Write a protein that binds this ligand. Structure first.
Ligand SMILES: O=C(O)/C=C/c1ccc(NC(=O)C2(NC(=O)c3ccc4c(C5CCCCC5)c5n(c4c3)CC(=O)Nc3ccccc3-5)CCCC2)cc1
Ligand SMILES: O=C(Nc1c(OCc2ccc(Cl)cc2)cccc1C(=O)O)c1ccccc1
Length: 550
């Protein structure tokens, strides 16, 4: 069937992407799907289902689902918003219960969704091609979104790890992700790795793929209401349904993956892993190790020879293509771990204070810098700069440019204690900048504060990027950081900890740096568990048992 059909009504609004480029994207994502399954597919599926059978899922109460709703989440068209939901207002709660009852009673009627163009900031690079069109977001009403959490929050948080095990990428912090990749690479006699990029993955997801995902969720121990809600949500929402623009006009119809449903990440991860694990068998790849994050797939295997590796890679592609997962860019075999770009990141190595080797994840900093620039210029709902500091804390660019620049602004605005929202693995987190030393110590280790001996390739990439974007050179940043550090140190408490730990690199005479005693208390239990892209998930960071002296 067609992934999408359009009435012709425009995708109306609500360098950066806008609704004007939405037409160009619609042409790309609108196509008929051709899917052929085989024995490898069926075998992998049964193996996945057997592991899913060990899961016991819980039905979330109305109160629990409401607290998971972001405060700025889209308002319902039924006279209430995210604030009313979080406060457990009578109107919001009564509507949610009516939506739930309707899922238990109605098993067939398609549920309405809103289609909208995403406004994301990308960089002005005219050296190769032109500006990329806006990505599209498809989401149901706020009421349907709360019910999705009640039925599937515990499923989508628990089931992917039980099924895929160590292959589930969202169970890893950036440090654990590097540990997984390095251990996998060094485990092979002669290693070969590749990244597989699917052209419009959400559009390649067929209605059978969605029914197959349900067959996996149905293996959980579920409360009868959860079982019926999952069944009704599959037929009425996940399989497809009608599209409505921001103005209320009928836009068309969807028969592929919705980007803004709770099961988007989980379903995409399961589907990608299933087709890839089956394709690995068809291509007859040796001792495979996979790492899957939604549509992002990386495979580390045992090399069979340059010509053989090229041949097996074409065979994997032909299998993936049959499964309705064709590539955008054809996959390339890599014989260095540092040469693999996975989740827009690559492995690099530095040294700690004692000269010991330390692996970390980095990336080209063009887009993180351009987005941080937009964020200082115009106040945005999500602060990509904060998330980049959290995720890329051990990197040369996040320490010298992002940390320095934003701590100087927070010092000037007297907003260090002010909690800001950032997206990590699709979920929204309300974090206070003062908590950054503690967070970094937990996700990356004490070493992240005393890392040095960066590679020539990494230094040159950071330096070239700064030149290309008109950003002052690294020496200017070291000078600015010494002032930021001094001002922070003088303020005491958590602010001094920010100066001492985050800007230790900026001083000629480096400090000892003992572990931060309060970092243990940080409740990070809901941090590197699962992916919730388009899931509309929110968590405010909390401290467990605070000591009076902290
Ligand atoms: O000795 C030498 O040979 C050269 C020395 C040298 C060169 C330039 C400066 N610039 C400055 O002082 C000013 N800009 C900055 O001190 C500045 C700070 C951050 C900047 C950023 C980002 C960096 C990441 C966090 C968010 C801000 C961008 N740009 C920045 C410029 C350059 C810019 O203007 N815009 C962009 C656009 C896209 C991407 C990055 C940038 C402030 C007043 C006058 C301009 C300072 C020293
Ligand atoms: O979580 C981040 N990005 C996402 C993602 O990460 C995969 C991934 C990327 C880099 C590392 Cl080091 C490790 C894993 C997979 C799915 C969804 C999202 C998302 O957009 O929320 C995110 C947040 C702040 C900086 C950078 C990335």
């Amino acid at each position: 069937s067609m992934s999408y059909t359009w009435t012709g009504a425009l995708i109306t609004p609500c360098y950066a992407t806008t609704s004007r480029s939405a037409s160009l994207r619609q042409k790309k994502v609108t196509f008929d799907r051709l899917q052929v399954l085989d024995d490898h597919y069926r075998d992998v599926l049964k193996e996945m289902k057997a592991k899913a059978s060990t899961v016991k899922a819980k039905l979330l109460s109305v109160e629990e689902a409401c607290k998971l709703t972001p405060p700025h989440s889209a308002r319902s068209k039924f006279g209430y918003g995210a604030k009313d939901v979080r406060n457990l207002s009578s109107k919001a709660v009564n509507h949610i219960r009516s939506v739930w009852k309707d899922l238990l009673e109605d098993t067939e009627t398609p549920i309405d969704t809103t289609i909208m163009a995403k406004n994301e900031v990308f960089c002005v690079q005219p050296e190769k091609g032109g500006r990329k069109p806006a990505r599209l977001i498809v989401f149901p009403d706020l009421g349907v979104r709360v019910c999705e959490k009640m039925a599937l929050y515990d499923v989508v948080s628990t089931l992917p790890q039980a099924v895929m095990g160590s292959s589930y990428g969202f169970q890893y912090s950036p440090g654990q992700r590097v540990e997984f990749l390095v251990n996998a690479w060094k485990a092979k006699k002669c290693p070969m790795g590749f990244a597989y990029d699917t052209r419009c993955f959400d559009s390649t997801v067929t209605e059978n793929d969605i029914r197959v995902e349900e067959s996996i969720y149905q293996c959980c121990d579920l409360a009868p209401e959860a079982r019926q809600a999952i069944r009704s949500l599959t037929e009425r929402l996940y399989i497809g349904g009608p599209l409505t623009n921001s103005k209320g006009q009928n836009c068309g119809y969807r028969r592929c993956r919705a980007s803004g449903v709770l099961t988007t990440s989980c379903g995409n991860t399961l589907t990608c892993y299933l087709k890839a694990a089956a394709a690995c068998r068809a291509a007859k790849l040796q001792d495979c190790t996979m790492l899957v994050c939604g549509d992002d797939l990386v495979v580390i295997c045992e090399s069979a020879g340059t010509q053989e590796d090229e041949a097996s890679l074409r065979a994997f592609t032909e299998a993936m293509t049959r499964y309705s997962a064709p590539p955008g860019d054809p996959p390339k075999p890599e014989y260095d771990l540092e040469l693999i770009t996975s989740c827009s990141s690559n492995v690099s190595v530095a040294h700690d204070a004692s000269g010991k080797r330390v692996y970390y994840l980095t990336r080209d900093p063009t887009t993180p810098l351009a987005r941080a620039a937009w964020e200082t210029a115009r106040h945005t709902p999500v602060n990509s700069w904060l998330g980049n500091i959290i995720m890329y804390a051990p990197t040369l660019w996040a320490r010298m440019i992002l940390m320095t620049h934003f701590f100087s602004i927070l010092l000037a605005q007297e907003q260090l204690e002010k909690a800001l929202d950032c997206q990590i693995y699709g979920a929204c987190y309300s974090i206070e900048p003062l908590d950054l030393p503690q967070i970094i110590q937990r996700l990356h280790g004490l070493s992240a504060f005393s890392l040095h001996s960066y590679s020539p390739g990494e230094i040159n990439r950071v330096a070239s990027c700064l030149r290309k974007l008109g950003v002052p050179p690294l020496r200017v940043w070291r000078h600015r950081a010494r002032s930021v550090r001094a001002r922070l140190l003088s303020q005491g408490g958590r602010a001094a900890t920010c100066g001492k730990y985050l800007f230790n690199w900026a001083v000629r005479t480096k400090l000892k740096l003992t572990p931060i005693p309060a970092a243990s208390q940080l409740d990070l239990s809901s941090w590197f568990v699962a992916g919730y892209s388009g899931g509309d998930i929110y968590h405010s960071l909390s401290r467990a048992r605070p000591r009076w002296f902290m």
